[PDB]
Design an enzyme around this catalytic site. Structure first.
Site, PDB file in Angstrom:
ATOM      1  CG  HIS B  41      -0.489   0.104   2.554  1.00 45.27           C
ATOM      2  ND1 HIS B  41      -0.960  -0.670   3.599  1.00 45.27           N
ATOM      3  CD2 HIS B  41       0.379   0.982   3.110  1.00 45.27           C
ATOM      4  CE1 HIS B  41      -0.356  -0.312   4.728  1.00 45.27           C
ATOM      5  NE2 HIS B  41       0.466   0.684   4.453  1.00 45.27           N
ATOM      6  N   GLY B 138       2.775   5.660  10.706  1.00 45.32           N
ATOM      7  CA  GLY B 138       4.156   5.480  10.331  1.00 45.32           C
ATOM      8  C   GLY B 138       4.712   4.127  10.668  1.00 45.32           C
ATOM      9  CB  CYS B 140       2.594   0.538   7.537  1.00 44.65           C
ATOM     10  SG  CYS B 140       0.978   1.087   8.016  1.00 44.65           S
TER      11      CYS B 140
END
EC number: 3.4.19.12
Lengths: 296, 296
Positions: B41, B138, B140
């Protein structure tokens, strides 16, 4: 979102852990620059440690860094720690400080056996100067620390388990936290208390994460709250504590003395089957700093 | 003595964490050999990811390992992870495996921001395939792992926060744990259950550490206990679970079905103001392995 007991990343400390053996006693040491620090009780077999150390030589100390033997070229005692000078400076020495922490403050523990790191967890220095760690035989010399930017602030070295199963140790200058000694006595943890400012910090963490059921419209006075704290074996709350909680109070819009009214209610009535951040007890091992670090 | 939520030492994983930026989106990647793994993503700005990736070039990906920029020489998609081939093999790559874990199993999480490790904690994969982590914007691309001997078994990569504040992600092959997707939907965690074998393991940990008040002379049958488990939204206990608890049962001398009678009593009556290993709730995020690792 979420709130966990969270340790600092342990890599910078892992590269400093070594095995120290003297006689039949093996425990852990901390290798920084060309010095290995470890509990002086490694030289025991009551004791007069100055006599015990005079009778030792460099060759009586075996220091192993992973698979490499480090040759000891000097030995000395500093309070309750031994300093073994070795012929090699640790190439993985981080930027570091030796700091002494205060009761109520938290730190990470790298539990270690035979110089090999086993796990990492968070502990608080209790008001009675013990820690509720997780240590087995062989863990002496494991260290506690905090990390800020690239700098490791070492604050704890493990020396012993007390009869109730809690733990006692020194700062890295070898000075014990609390009224404990590295000899055989009936010493025991004194009475403890709950760290009030930390409980309030954790309630703010809960609010930030959406737990609001314990909130109320009331506010209390500092003096009135401290009367309740004393009754429930909680530490007094100071104006400095109120000030330190300022940023969390502002973020949530709940004044500190408003949260104190919530804590009074919780102490007097319990939770009525509800939970806060997954706990059915009031948690006191998160500092305001810990909360700001993970919640923001 | 003691019992803590204890993570594996994180050093071997810290040296694999990098920053991946594409467009205005920054998150974390895992750098092993000459490949950086991160959530696909990152290329979003509903989506057709195959179309989105065809429209990208190597130069659209900025990968930073500390202060060193790693040049991306290839890019591909594998399920919900992106694989960025870089021109440098990570010199700190540990021995590693990509393993998928089962609900009920635990792992350590190295929470990371901007490629920089921030903290380490222990999580369990919930029966409903979420984890109750601690993640902020932040995070991920942060990973979960277990370590055995020198080998890092990566089992989790972080992708998203669900509406209740719990967390969802993939294995390192990019396949989601649970019925979740890396696009914008009203997806929510399903109903959860309590991990029975873990609760029993933790009761054995408590006995090993001297908490005995919940013990009793009674024994129950597996079938009778599983009737009670179903009533309290606990997972069924299997004969394999009984077998896995064998070593802890032997060490403590409390047969598994004897401990099951204790758990039945605790579920039906609560604790009457007492605590077990410092908790007023039944803890289900320690596996039998976790208990054997720390208690022995």
């Amino acid at each position: 979102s979420g709130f966990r007991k969270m340790a600092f990343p342990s890599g910078k400390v892992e590269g400093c852990m070594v095995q120290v053996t003297c006689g039949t006693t093996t425990l852990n040491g901390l290798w920084l620059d060309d010095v290995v620090y470890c509990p002086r009780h490694v030289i025991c077999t009551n004791p007069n440690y100055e006599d015990l150390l005079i009778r030792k030589s460099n060759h009586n100390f075996l220091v192993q860094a992973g698979n490499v033997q480090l040759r000891v070229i000097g030995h000395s005692m500093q309070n309750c720690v031994l300093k073994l000078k070795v012929d090699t400076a640790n190439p993985k020495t981080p930027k570091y400080k030796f700091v002494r922490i205060q009761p109520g403050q938290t730190f990470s523990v790298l539990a270690c056996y035979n110089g090999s790191p086993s796990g990492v967890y968070q502990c608080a220095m209790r008001p009675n100067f013990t820690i509720k760690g997780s240590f087995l035989n062989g863990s002496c010399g494991s260290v506690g620390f905090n990390i800020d930017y690239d700098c490791v602030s070492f604050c704890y070295m493990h020396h012993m388990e007390l009869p109730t199963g809690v733990h006692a140790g020194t700062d890295l200058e070898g000075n014990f936290y609390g009224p404990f000694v590295d000899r055989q006595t009936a010493q025991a943890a004194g009475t403890d208390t709950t760290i009030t400012v930390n409980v309030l910090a954790w309630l703010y963490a809960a609010v930030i994460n959406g737990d609001r059921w314990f909130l109320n419209r009331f506010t209390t006075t500092l003096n009135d709250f401290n009367l309740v704290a004393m009754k429930y074996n909680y530490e007094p709350l100071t104006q400095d504590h109120v000030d330190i909680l300022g940023p969390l109070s502002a973020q949530t819009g709940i004044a500190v003395l408003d949260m104190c009214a919530s804590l009074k209610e919780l102490l007097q009535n319990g939770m009525n089957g509800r939970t806060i951040l997954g706990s059915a007890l009031l948690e006191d091992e998160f500092t305001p700093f810990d909360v700001v670090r993970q919640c923001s």
